[PDB]
Amino acid sequence: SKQLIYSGKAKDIYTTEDENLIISTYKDQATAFNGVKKEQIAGKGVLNNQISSFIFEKLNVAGVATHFVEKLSDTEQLNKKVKIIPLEVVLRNYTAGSFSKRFGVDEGIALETPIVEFYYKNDDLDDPFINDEHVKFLQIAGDQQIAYLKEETRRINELLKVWFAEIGLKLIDFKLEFGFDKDGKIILADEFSPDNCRLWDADGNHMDKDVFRRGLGELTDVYEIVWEKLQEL
Amino acid sequence: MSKQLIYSGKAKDIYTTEDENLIISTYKDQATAFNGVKKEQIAGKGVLNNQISSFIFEKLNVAGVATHFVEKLSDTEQLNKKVKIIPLEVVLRNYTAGSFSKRFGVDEGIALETPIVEFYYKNDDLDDPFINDEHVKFLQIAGDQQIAYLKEETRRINELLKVWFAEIGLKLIDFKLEFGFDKDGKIILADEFSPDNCRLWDADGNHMDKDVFRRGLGELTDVYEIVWEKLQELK
Ligand SMILES: Nc1ncnc2c1ncn2[C@@H]1O[C@H](COP(=O)(O)OP(=O)(O)O)[C@@H](O)[C@H]1O
Ligand SMILES: Nc1ncnc2c1ncn2[C@@H]1O[C@H](COP(=O)(O)OP(=O)(O)O)[C@@H](O)[C@H]1O
Numbered sequence: 001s002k003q004l005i006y007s008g009k010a011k012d013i014y015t016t017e018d019e020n021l022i023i024s025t026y027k028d029q030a031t032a033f034n035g036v037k038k039e040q041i042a043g044k045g046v047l048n049n050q051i052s053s054f055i056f057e058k059l060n061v062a063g064v065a066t067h068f069v070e071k072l073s074d075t076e077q078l079n080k081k082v083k084i085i086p087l088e089v090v091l092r093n094y095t096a097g098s099f100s101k102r103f104g105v106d107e108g109i110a111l112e113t114p115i116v117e118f119y120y121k122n123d124d125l126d127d128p129f130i131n132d133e134h135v136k137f138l139q140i141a142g143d144q145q146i147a148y149l150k151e152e153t154r155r156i157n158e159l160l161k162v163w164f165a166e167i168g169l170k171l172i173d174f175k176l177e178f179g180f181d182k183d184g185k186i187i188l189a190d191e192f193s194p195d196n197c198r199l200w201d202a203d204g205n206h207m208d209k210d211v212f213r214r215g216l217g218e219l220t221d222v223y224e225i226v227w228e229k230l231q232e233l
Numbered sequence: 234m235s236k237q238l239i240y241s242g243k244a245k246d247i248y249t250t251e252d253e254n255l256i257i258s259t260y261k262d263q264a265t266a267f268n269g270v271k272k273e274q275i276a277g278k279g280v281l282n283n284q285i286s287s288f289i290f291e292k293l294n295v296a297g298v299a300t301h302f303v304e305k306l307s308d309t310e311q312l313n314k315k316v317k318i319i320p321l322e323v324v325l326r327n328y329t330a331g332s333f334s335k336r337f338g339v340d341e342g343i344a345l346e347t348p349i350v351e352f353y354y355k356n357d358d359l360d361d362p363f364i365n366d367e368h369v370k371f372l373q374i375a376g377d378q379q380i381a382y383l384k385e386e387t388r389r390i391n392e393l394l395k396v397w398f399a400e401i402g403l404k405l406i407d408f409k410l411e412f413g414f415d416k417d418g419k420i421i422l423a424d425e426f427s428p429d430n431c432r433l434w435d436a437d438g439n440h441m442d443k444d445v446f447r448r449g450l451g452e453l454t455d456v457y458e459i460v461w462e463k464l465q466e467l468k
Protein backbone atom coordinates (compact mmCIF):
# COMPACT_ATOMS: atom_id res chain seq x y z
CA SER A 1 0.00 0.00 0.00
CA LYS A 2 1.46 3.27 -1.28
CA GLN A 3 0.58 6.29 -3.46
CA LEU A 4 -0.62 6.64 -7.10
CA ILE A 5 1.62 9.02 -9.01
CA TYR A 6 0.35 8.74 -12.61
CA SER A 7 -2.55 6.92 -14.29
CA GLY A 8 -2.00 5.67 -17.83
CA LYS A 9 -3.63 3.78 -20.68
CA ALA A 10 -1.94 0.52 -19.81
CA LYS A 11 -0.26 1.34 -16.48
CA ASP A 12 -0.94 2.95 -13.08
CA ILE A 13 2.35 3.83 -11.25
CA TYR A 14 2.59 3.78 -7.41
CA THR A 15 5.28 4.81 -4.91
CA THR A 16 7.09 2.85 -2.18
CA GLU A 17 9.15 3.86 0.86
CA ASP A 18 12.20 4.30 -1.35
CA GLU A 19 12.17 7.67 -3.16
CA ASN A 20 14.09 6.15 -6.13
CA LEU A 21 11.69 3.21 -6.48
CA ILE A 22 8.30 2.71 -8.06
CA ILE A 23 5.95 -0.25 -8.47
CA SER A 24 4.33 -0.59 -11.85
CA THR A 25 0.85 -2.02 -12.22
CA TYR A 26 -0.27 -3.32 -15.63
CA LYS A 27 -3.96 -2.74 -16.41
CA ASP A 28 -6.38 -4.60 -18.69
CA GLN A 29 -7.09 -1.45 -20.67
CA ALA A 30 -6.57 -1.77 -24.37
CA THR A 31 -6.76 1.36 -26.54
CA ALA A 32 -6.57 1.66 -30.36
CA PHE A 33 -4.89 4.31 -32.56
CA ASN A 34 -4.47 7.90 -31.26
CA GLY A 35 -8.29 8.37 -31.41
CA VAL A 36 -8.40 6.36 -28.14
CA LYS A 37 -11.31 3.91 -28.59
CA LYS A 38 -11.32 2.01 -25.29
CA GLU A 39 -11.85 -1.67 -24.54
CA GLN A 40 -10.90 -3.49 -21.30
CA ILE A 41 -9.70 -7.00 -22.20
CA ALA A 42 -8.96 -9.70 -19.59
CA GLY A 43 -5.55 -11.24 -18.79
CA LYS A 44 -3.73 -8.52 -20.75
CA GLY A 45 -2.16 -6.89 -17.69
CA VAL A 46 -0.61 -10.22 -16.61
CA LEU A 47 0.83 -11.23 -20.05
CA ASN A 48 2.27 -7.78 -20.65
CA ASN A 49 3.80 -7.78 -17.13
CA GLN A 50 5.20 -11.31 -17.68
CA ILE A 51 6.58 -10.61 -21.17
CA SER A 52 7.99 -7.23 -20.18
CA SER A 53 9.49 -8.59 -16.93
CA PHE A 54 11.17 -11.41 -18.94
CA ILE A 55 12.70 -9.33 -21.78
CA PHE A 56 13.77 -6.63 -19.36
CA GLU A 57 15.53 -9.25 -17.22
CA LYS A 58 17.10 -10.82 -20.31
CA LEU A 59 18.36 -7.29 -21.22
CA ASN A 60 19.78 -6.73 -17.78
CA VAL A 61 21.62 -10.04 -18.02
CA ALA A 62 22.97 -8.81 -21.39
CA GLY A 63 24.17 -5.65 -19.58
CA VAL A 64 21.64 -3.20 -20.94
CA ALA A 65 20.97 -0.67 -18.16
CA THR A 66 17.26 -0.62 -17.36
CA HIS A 67 14.58 0.21 -14.75
CA PHE A 68 13.96 -3.48 -13.91
CA VAL A 69 14.46 -4.83 -10.42
CA GLU A 70 11.92 -7.70 -10.02
CA LYS A 71 8.49 -8.88 -11.11
CA LEU A 72 6.52 -8.55 -7.91
CA SER A 73 3.09 -9.86 -8.94
CA ASP A 74 0.94 -11.07 -11.78
CA THR A 75 -0.04 -7.46 -12.10
CA GLU A 76 2.97 -5.56 -10.72
CA GLN A 77 6.74 -5.21 -11.04
CA LEU A 78 9.23 -3.08 -9.10
CA ASN A 79 11.11 -0.53 -11.16
CA LYS A 80 13.83 2.04 -10.55
CA LYS A 81 12.08 5.46 -10.71
CA VAL A 82 13.46 7.55 -13.53
CA LYS A 83 12.63 11.02 -14.86
CA ILE A 84 10.97 10.17 -18.27
CA ILE A 85 12.41 11.59 -21.51
CA PRO A 86 9.19 12.61 -23.45
CA LEU A 87 10.63 11.08 -26.60
CA GLU A 88 9.29 7.77 -27.94
CA VAL A 89 12.18 6.00 -29.70
CA VAL A 90 10.99 3.84 -32.58
CA LEU A 91 13.37 1.51 -34.37
CA ARG A 92 12.14 -0.06 -37.60
CA ASN A 93 13.45 -3.34 -39.08
CA TYR A 94 10.68 -3.70 -41.69
CA THR A 95 8.12 -1.36 -43.26
CA ALA A 96 4.68 -1.36 -41.51
CA GLY A 97 1.85 0.91 -40.29
CA SER A 98 2.81 4.62 -40.22
CA PHE A 99 6.06 4.18 -42.21
CA SER A 100 4.13 2.32 -44.83
CA LYS A 101 1.52 5.14 -44.86
CA ARG A 102 4.09 7.89 -44.86
CA PHE A 103 5.93 6.28 -47.74
CA GLY A 104 2.92 4.67 -49.54
CA VAL A 105 4.79 1.33 -49.58
CA ASP A 106 3.58 -2.08 -48.41
CA GLU A 107 4.25 -3.72 -45.06
CA GLY A 108 6.80 -6.52 -44.87
CA ILE A 109 9.60 -4.79 -46.84
CA ALA A 110 12.91 -5.46 -45.02
CA LEU A 111 15.31 -2.64 -44.13
CA GLU A 112 19.07 -2.90 -43.67
CA THR A 113 20.19 -0.82 -41.89
CA PRO A 114 17.20 -0.23 -39.54
CA ILE A 115 15.70 3.31 -39.22
CA VAL A 116 15.05 5.07 -35.86
CA GLU A 117 12.48 7.81 -35.37
CA PHE A 118 11.67 10.10 -32.47
CA TYR A 119 8.10 11.06 -31.51
CA TYR A 120 7.28 13.72 -28.93
CA LYS A 121 5.55 11.83 -26.14
CA ASN A 122 2.83 14.46 -25.78
CA ASP A 123 -0.73 13.05 -25.94
CA ASP A 124 -2.12 16.57 -26.56
CA LEU A 125 0.06 17.03 -29.64
CA ASP A 126 -0.94 13.50 -30.74
CA ASP A 127 2.64 12.28 -30.13
CA PRO A 128 3.95 13.91 -33.29
CA PHE A 129 6.94 12.60 -35.27
CA ILE A 130 9.92 14.90 -34.89
CA ASN A 131 13.53 15.35 -36.00
CA ASP A 132 16.77 15.91 -34.05
CA GLU A 133 16.53 19.71 -34.25
CA HIS A 134 12.94 19.59 -32.94
CA VAL A 135 14.16 17.65 -30.00
CA LYS A 136 16.89 20.27 -29.31
CA PHE A 137 14.39 23.09 -29.72
CA LEU A 138 12.18 21.18 -27.24
CA GLN A 139 15.23 21.00 -24.94
CA ILE A 140 14.56 17.35 -24.17
CA ALA A 141 18.19 16.54 -25.02
CA GLY A 142 21.16 18.00 -26.83
CA ASP A 143 23.69 16.31 -29.06
CA GLN A 144 25.60 13.46 -27.34
CA GLN A 145 22.17 12.59 -25.81
CA ILE A 146 20.44 12.18 -29.21
CA ALA A 147 23.35 10.01 -30.41
CA TYR A 148 23.18 7.92 -27.22
CA LEU A 149 19.43 7.20 -27.64
CA LYS A 150 20.12 5.88 -31.12
CA GLU A 151 23.29 3.97 -30.32
CA GLU A 152 21.66 1.99 -27.51
CA THR A 153 18.27 1.41 -29.24
CA ARG A 154 20.23 -0.24 -32.03
CA ARG A 155 22.16 -2.38 -29.54
CA ILE A 156 18.77 -3.20 -28.09
CA ASN A 157 17.45 -4.13 -31.55
CA GLU A 158 20.40 -6.45 -32.07
CA LEU A 159 19.81 -8.42 -28.90
CA LEU A 160 16.05 -8.47 -29.25
CA LYS A 161 15.96 -9.35 -32.96
CA VAL A 162 18.16 -12.41 -32.33
CA TRP A 163 15.99 -13.62 -29.44
CA PHE A 164 12.65 -13.43 -31.26
CA ALA A 165 14.21 -15.12 -34.21
CA GLU A 166 15.17 -18.09 -32.03
CA ILE A 167 11.48 -18.43 -31.13
CA GLY A 168 10.39 -17.94 -34.74
CA LEU A 169 9.17 -14.34 -34.76
CA LYS A 170 10.56 -11.47 -36.78
CA LEU A 171 11.04 -8.24 -34.89
CA ILE A 172 9.37 -5.81 -37.36
CA ASP A 173 9.66 -2.65 -35.20
CA PHE A 174 9.52 -1.49 -31.62
CA LYS A 175 9.24 1.60 -29.40
CA LEU A 176 11.25 2.50 -26.31
CA GLU A 177 11.07 5.11 -23.60
CA PHE A 178 14.15 6.18 -21.65
CA GLY A 179 14.56 8.39 -18.58
CA PHE A 180 17.05 9.54 -15.97
CA ASP A 181 17.68 7.53 -12.80
CA LYS A 182 18.40 9.16 -9.39
CA ASP A 183 22.07 9.30 -10.48
CA GLY A 184 21.31 11.20 -13.67
CA LYS A 185 22.15 8.54 -16.25
CA ILE A 186 19.91 7.40 -19.08
CA ILE A 187 18.15 4.08 -18.79
CA LEU A 188 15.69 1.89 -20.71
CA ALA A 189 12.35 2.31 -18.94
CA ASP A 190 8.61 1.72 -19.53
CA GLU A 191 7.95 -1.80 -20.78
CA PHE A 192 8.62 -4.06 -23.75
CA SER A 193 5.44 -6.10 -24.51
CA PRO A 194 3.55 -6.87 -27.76
CA ASP A 195 1.78 -3.54 -27.27
CA ASN A 196 4.80 -1.46 -28.24
CA CYS A 197 6.45 -3.66 -30.87
CA ARG A 198 5.35 -5.56 -33.98
CA LEU A 199 5.75 -9.29 -34.28
CA TRP A 200 5.42 -11.27 -37.40
CA ASP A 201 4.78 -14.95 -37.56
CA ALA A 202 7.01 -16.58 -40.17
CA ASP A 203 3.70 -16.77 -42.07
CA GLY A 204 2.88 -13.06 -41.72
CA ASN A 205 0.55 -13.70 -38.75
CA HIS A 206 0.55 -10.68 -36.41
CA MET A 207 1.59 -11.72 -32.89
CA ASP A 208 1.05 -8.21 -31.50
CA LYS A 209 -1.34 -5.28 -30.84
CA ASP A 210 -2.23 -5.04 -34.60
CA VAL A 211 -4.77 -7.79 -33.70
CA PHE A 212 -6.80 -5.31 -31.55
CA ARG A 213 -6.52 -2.46 -34.09
CA ARG A 214 -6.90 -4.20 -37.51
CA GLY A 215 -9.16 -6.65 -35.67
CA LEU A 216 -7.79 -10.00 -36.85
CA GLY A 217 -8.59 -11.96 -33.66
CA GLU A 218 -8.80 -11.80 -29.88
CA LEU A 219 -5.80 -10.18 -28.19
CA THR A 220 -4.95 -12.41 -25.19
CA ASP A 221 -4.61 -15.34 -27.65
CA VAL A 222 -1.62 -14.10 -29.63
CA TYR A 223 -0.07 -12.65 -26.48
CA GLU A 224 -0.57 -16.03 -24.77
CA ILE A 225 1.35 -17.57 -27.75
CA VAL A 226 4.22 -15.09 -27.49
CA TRP A 227 4.48 -15.64 -23.75
CA GLU A 228 4.54 -19.42 -24.36
CA LYS A 229 7.30 -19.10 -27.00
CA LEU A 230 9.49 -16.80 -24.84
CA GLN A 231 9.95 -19.45 -22.13
CA GLU A 232 11.71 -21.40 -24.87
CA LEU A 233 14.64 -19.18 -23.85
CA MET B 234 10.09 31.57 -77.43
CA SER B 235 9.49 28.11 -79.02
CA LYS B 236 10.81 24.68 -77.89
CA GLN B 237 9.41 21.58 -76.09
CA LEU B 238 7.99 20.76 -72.66
CA ILE B 239 10.00 18.80 -70.05
CA TYR B 240 7.41 18.97 -67.28
CA SER B 241 4.33 20.93 -66.22
CA GLY B 242 4.15 21.98 -62.55
CA LYS B 243 1.47 23.73 -60.50
CA ALA B 244 3.38 27.05 -60.79
CA LYS B 245 5.93 26.51 -63.58
CA ASP B 246 6.07 25.02 -67.11
CA ILE B 247 9.73 24.33 -67.87
CA TYR B 248 10.89 24.21 -71.53
CA THR B 249 13.99 23.02 -73.35
CA THR B 250 16.65 25.04 -75.11
CA GLU B 251 19.12 24.29 -77.90
CA ASP B 252 21.60 24.16 -75.02
CA GLU B 253 21.13 20.74 -73.38
CA ASN B 254 22.29 22.27 -70.04
CA LEU B 255 19.92 25.22 -70.07
CA ILE B 256 16.18 25.31 -69.23
CA ILE B 257 13.78 28.17 -69.82
CA SER B 258 11.32 28.49 -66.92
CA THR B 259 7.86 29.88 -67.46
CA TYR B 260 6.00 31.18 -64.38
CA LYS B 261 2.21 30.69 -64.53
CA ASP B 262 -0.75 32.79 -63.20
CA GLN B 263 -1.97 29.68 -61.35
CA ALA B 264 -2.22 29.49 -57.52
CA THR B 265 -2.86 26.18 -55.70
CA ALA B 266 -3.82 25.57 -52.07
CA PHE B 267 -2.68 23.00 -49.50
CA ASN B 268 -2.55 19.50 -50.92
CA GLY B 269 -3.13 20.78 -54.44
CA VAL B 270 -6.74 20.88 -53.24
CA LYS B 271 -8.12 24.29 -54.32
CA LYS B 272 -6.69 26.34 -57.22
CA GLU B 273 -7.44 29.63 -58.95
CA GLN B 274 -6.19 31.65 -61.91
CA ILE B 275 -4.89 34.92 -60.58
CA ALA B 276 -3.68 37.38 -63.21
CA GLY B 277 -0.21 38.97 -62.96
CA LYS B 278 0.95 36.32 -60.48
CA GLY B 279 3.57 34.62 -62.71
CA VAL B 280 5.02 37.98 -63.75
CA LEU B 281 5.04 39.30 -60.20
CA ASN B 282 6.64 36.07 -59.06
CA ASN B 283 9.06 36.03 -61.97
CA GLN B 284 10.64 39.37 -61.08
CA ILE B 285 10.85 38.57 -57.34
CA SER B 286 12.62 35.30 -57.99
CA SER B 287 14.97 36.66 -60.67
CA PHE B 288 15.87 39.63 -58.37
CA ILE B 289 16.58 37.47 -55.27
CA PHE B 290 18.43 34.85 -57.30
CA GLU B 291 20.52 37.64 -58.89
CA LYS B 292 21.45 39.14 -55.51
CA LEU B 293 22.40 35.58 -54.37
CA ASN B 294 24.64 35.14 -57.42
CA VAL B 295 26.37 38.44 -56.60
CA ALA B 296 26.69 37.39 -52.95
CA GLY B 297 28.37 34.09 -54.04
CA VAL B 298 25.63 31.47 -53.88
CA ALA B 299 25.69 28.97 -56.72
CA THR B 300 22.28 28.94 -58.46
CA HIS B 301 20.40 27.88 -61.59
CA PHE B 302 19.88 31.48 -62.61
CA VAL B 303 21.32 32.97 -65.76
CA GLU B 304 18.95 35.84 -66.68
CA LYS B 305 15.35 36.96 -66.82
CA LEU B 306 14.06 36.39 -70.36
CA SER B 307 10.79 38.32 -69.99
CA ASP B 308 7.64 38.89 -67.98
CA THR B 309 6.88 35.28 -67.67
CA GLU B 310 10.14 33.53 -68.40
CA GLN B 311 13.68 33.15 -67.13
CA LEU B 312 16.65 31.11 -68.20
CA ASN B 313 18.00 28.52 -65.82
CA LYS B 314 20.72 25.85 -65.69
CA LYS B 315 19.25 22.32 -66.03
CA VAL B 316 19.62 20.34 -62.85
CA LYS B 317 18.79 16.88 -61.82
CA ILE B 318 16.45 18.11 -59.01
CA ILE B 319 16.82 16.71 -55.48
CA PRO B 320 13.28 15.62 -54.57
CA LEU B 321 13.71 17.19 -51.12
CA GLU B 322 11.90 20.35 -50.17
CA VAL B 323 14.16 22.11 -47.66
CA VAL B 324 12.37 24.40 -45.19
CA LEU B 325 14.27 26.79 -42.88
CA ARG B 326 12.28 28.34 -39.99
CA ASN B 327 13.23 31.63 -38.22
CA TYR B 328 9.81 32.23 -36.58
CA THR B 329 6.94 29.78 -35.87
CA ALA B 330 4.06 29.60 -38.37
CA GLY B 331 1.67 27.12 -39.98
CA SER B 332 2.80 23.50 -39.90
CA PHE B 333 5.40 23.88 -37.09
CA SER B 334 2.72 25.75 -35.25
CA LYS B 335 0.38 22.77 -35.97
CA ARG B 336 2.59 19.93 -34.87
CA PHE B 337 3.91 21.64 -31.76
CA GLY B 338 0.66 23.31 -30.76
CA VAL B 339 1.92 26.85 -30.36
CA ASP B 340 1.16 30.23 -31.87
CA GLU B 341 2.24 31.69 -35.17
CA GLY B 342 4.82 34.37 -34.31
CA ILE B 343 7.43 33.12 -31.84
CA ALA B 344 11.08 33.75 -32.76
CA LEU B 345 13.28 30.69 -32.94
CA GLU B 346 16.96 30.95 -32.18
CA THR B 347 18.46 28.86 -33.67
CA PRO B 348 16.47 28.49 -36.93
CA ILE B 349 15.06 24.93 -37.57
CA VAL B 350 15.61 23.22 -40.97
CA GLU B 351 13.08 20.58 -42.16
CA PHE B 352 13.13 18.14 -45.07
CA TYR B 353 9.99 17.05 -46.93
CA TYR B 354 10.12 14.39 -49.72
CA LYS B 355 9.12 16.15 -52.95
CA ASN B 356 6.58 13.54 -54.07
CA ASP B 357 3.08 14.81 -54.68
CA ASP B 358 1.42 11.40 -54.40
CA LEU B 359 2.64 11.26 -50.77
CA ASP B 360 1.59 14.91 -50.11
CA ASP B 361 5.30 15.75 -49.66
CA PRO B 362 5.46 14.14 -46.23
CA PHE B 363 7.86 15.34 -43.55
CA ILE B 364 10.93 13.13 -43.32
CA ASN B 365 14.07 12.89 -41.21
CA ASP B 366 17.73 12.32 -42.22
CA GLU B 367 17.63 8.51 -42.13
CA HIS B 368 14.55 8.53 -44.40
CA VAL B 369 16.55 10.49 -46.92
CA LYS B 370 19.30 7.84 -46.87
CA PHE B 371 16.64 5.18 -47.12
CA LEU B 372 15.13 7.06 -50.07
CA GLN B 373 18.63 7.08 -51.63
CA ILE B 374 18.38 10.84 -52.16
CA ALA B 375 21.72 11.85 -50.52
CA GLY B 376 24.56 10.64 -48.34
CA ASP B 377 25.44 12.28 -45.01
CA GLN B 378 28.12 14.71 -46.29
CA GLN B 379 25.52 15.91 -48.79
CA ILE B 380 22.65 16.36 -46.29
CA ALA B 381 25.13 18.33 -44.20
CA TYR B 382 25.82 20.46 -47.32
CA LEU B 383 22.11 21.18 -47.99
CA LYS B 384 21.84 22.31 -44.34
CA GLU B 385 24.82 24.60 -44.07
CA GLU B 386 23.97 26.21 -47.40
CA THR B 387 20.28 26.84 -46.54
CA ARG B 388 21.58 28.49 -43.39
CA ARG B 389 24.05 30.91 -44.95
CA ILE B 390 21.27 31.52 -47.45
CA ASN B 391 18.86 32.58 -44.63
CA GLU B 392 21.65 34.76 -43.28
CA LEU B 393 21.47 36.90 -46.42
CA LEU B 394 17.77 36.74 -47.11
CA LYS B 395 16.80 37.70 -43.57
CA VAL B 396 18.99 40.85 -43.79
CA TRP B 397 17.73 42.13 -47.15
CA PHE B 398 14.19 41.70 -45.97
CA ALA B 399 15.04 43.38 -42.71
CA GLU B 400 16.39 46.41 -44.58
CA ILE B 401 13.05 46.79 -46.46
CA GLY B 402 11.16 45.98 -43.26
CA LEU B 403 10.18 42.38 -43.92
CA LYS B 404 10.04 39.55 -41.42
CA LEU B 405 11.44 36.32 -42.95
CA ILE B 406 9.38 33.84 -40.88
CA ASP B 407 10.34 30.79 -43.03
CA PHE B 408 11.10 29.66 -46.57
CA LYS B 409 11.47 26.55 -48.70
CA LEU B 410 14.39 25.81 -50.97
CA GLU B 411 14.98 23.22 -53.70
CA PHE B 412 18.47 22.17 -54.83
CA GLY B 413 19.61 19.94 -57.72
CA PHE B 414 22.67 18.77 -59.64
CA ASP B 415 24.27 20.81 -62.46
CA LYS B 416 25.97 19.50 -65.65
CA ASP B 417 29.11 18.84 -63.56
CA GLY B 418 27.29 17.16 -60.69
CA LYS B 419 27.62 20.06 -58.24
CA ILE B 420 24.74 20.79 -55.86
CA ILE B 421 23.25 24.14 -56.83
CA LEU B 422 20.33 26.25 -55.58
CA ALA B 423 17.46 26.34 -58.05
CA ASP B 424 13.66 26.34 -58.46
CA GLU B 425 12.36 29.74 -57.35
CA PHE B 426 12.24 32.08 -54.42
CA SER B 427 8.84 33.79 -54.56
CA PRO B 428 6.28 34.56 -51.80
CA ASP B 429 4.52 31.28 -52.77
CA ASN B 430 7.61 29.78 -51.33
CA CYS B 431 8.26 31.70 -48.09
CA ARG B 432 6.68 33.72 -45.31
CA LEU B 433 7.20 37.44 -44.97
CA TRP B 434 5.42 39.18 -42.12
CA ASP B 435 4.88 42.84 -41.86
CA ALA B 436 5.92 44.68 -38.68
CA ASP B 437 2.15 44.95 -38.00
CA GLY B 438 2.09 41.20 -38.45
CA ASN B 439 0.50 41.52 -41.89
CA HIS B 440 0.86 38.64 -44.38
CA MET B 441 3.05 39.52 -47.33
CA ASP B 442 2.64 36.13 -49.07
CA LYS B 443 0.54 33.14 -50.24
CA ASP B 444 -0.99 32.90 -46.71
CA VAL B 445 -3.26 35.63 -48.15
CA PHE B 446 -4.48 32.96 -50.63
CA ARG B 447 -4.50 30.02 -48.15
CA ARG B 448 -6.23 31.81 -45.22
CA GLY B 449 -8.21 33.85 -47.84
CA LEU B 450 -7.46 37.21 -46.21
CA GLY B 451 -7.75 39.08 -49.49
CA GLU B 452 -6.15 39.09 -52.90
CA LEU B 453 -2.63 37.91 -53.67
CA THR B 454 -1.25 40.38 -56.23
CA ASP B 455 -1.78 43.40 -53.95
CA VAL B 456 0.72 42.04 -51.49
CA TYR B 457 3.04 40.49 -54.02
CA GLU B 458 3.29 43.86 -55.74
CA ILE B 459 4.05 45.61 -52.37
CA VAL B 460 6.96 43.23 -51.94
CA TRP B 461 8.12 43.76 -55.49
CA GLU B 462 8.04 47.51 -54.89
CA LYS B 463 9.92 47.17 -51.57
CA LEU B 464 12.59 44.83 -53.04
CA GLN B 465 13.25 47.46 -55.73
CA GLU B 466 14.47 49.75 -52.96
CA LEU B 467 17.56 47.61 -52.32
CA LYS B 468 21.38 47.64 -52.82
N1 LIG C 1 10.70 4.38 -14.16
C1 LIG C 1 9.67 5.22 -14.42
N2 LIG C 1 9.52 6.35 -13.68
C2 LIG C 1 8.49 7.19 -13.91
N3 LIG C 1 7.57 7.00 -14.89
C3 LIG C 1 7.62 5.90 -15.71
C4 LIG C 1 8.71 4.92 -15.51
N4 LIG C 1 8.51 3.97 -16.46
C5 LIG C 1 7.40 4.29 -17.18
N5 LIG C 1 6.90 5.44 -16.73
C6 LIG C 1 5.73 6.16 -17.19
O1 LIG C 1 4.58 5.57 -16.62
C7 LIG C 1 3.48 5.90 -17.47
C8 LIG C 1 2.70 4.61 -17.53
O2 LIG C 1 1.44 4.80 -18.16
P1 LIG C 1 1.26 4.19 -19.62
O3 LIG C 1 -0.18 3.76 -19.76
O4 LIG C 1 2.39 3.27 -19.99
O5 LIG C 1 1.52 5.58 -20.39
P2 LIG C 1 1.06 5.84 -21.91
O6 LIG C 1 -0.43 6.04 -21.73
O7 LIG C 1 1.86 7.08 -22.29
O8 LIG C 1 1.46 4.59 -22.69
C9 LIG C 1 4.07 6.34 -18.82
O9 LIG C 1 3.75 7.71 -19.05
C10 LIG C 1 5.57 6.14 -18.69
O10 LIG C 1 6.38 7.20 -19.22
N1 LIG D 1 16.79 24.20 -62.97
C1 LIG D 1 15.85 23.22 -63.02
N2 LIG D 1 15.99 22.17 -63.85
C2 LIG D 1 15.04 21.21 -63.93
N3 LIG D 1 13.91 21.18 -63.18
C3 LIG D 1 13.66 22.17 -62.28
C4 LIG D 1 14.64 23.27 -62.15
N4 LIG D 1 14.13 24.11 -61.21
C5 LIG D 1 12.93 23.60 -60.79
N5 LIG D 1 12.67 22.44 -61.41
C6 LIG D 1 11.49 21.57 -61.26
O1 LIG D 1 10.48 22.01 -62.17
C7 LIG D 1 9.19 21.89 -61.58
C8 LIG D 1 8.63 23.29 -61.57
O2 LIG D 1 7.22 23.25 -61.44
P1 LIG D 1 6.58 23.87 -60.11
O3 LIG D 1 5.13 24.22 -60.37
O4 LIG D 1 7.51 24.87 -59.43
O5 LIG D 1 6.61 22.51 -59.26
P2 LIG D 1 5.60 22.19 -58.04
O6 LIG D 1 4.24 22.10 -58.73
O7 LIG D 1 6.18 20.88 -57.52
O8 LIG D 1 5.75 23.37 -57.07
C9 LIG D 1 9.40 21.33 -60.17
O9 LIG D 1 9.21 19.90 -60.21
C10 LIG D 1 10.85 21.70 -59.89
O10 LIG D 1 11.53 20.89 -58.93
Ligand SMILES: [Cl-]
Pocket residue numbers: 129363
Ligand atom coordinates in the same frame (compact mmCIF):
# COMPACT_ATOMS: atom_id res chain seq x y z
CL1 LIG E 1 4.40 14.06 -39.93
Ligand SMILES: [Mg+2]
Pocket residue numbers: 010190
Ligand atom coordinates in the same frame (compact mmCIF):
# COMPACT_ATOMS: atom_id res chain seq x y z
MG1 LIG F 1 3.01 2.96 -22.76
Ligand SMILES: [Mg+2]
Pocket residue numbers: 242244424
Ligand atom coordinates in the same frame (compact mmCIF):
# COMPACT_ATOMS: atom_id res chain seq x y z
MG1 LIG G 1 7.60 24.52 -56.95
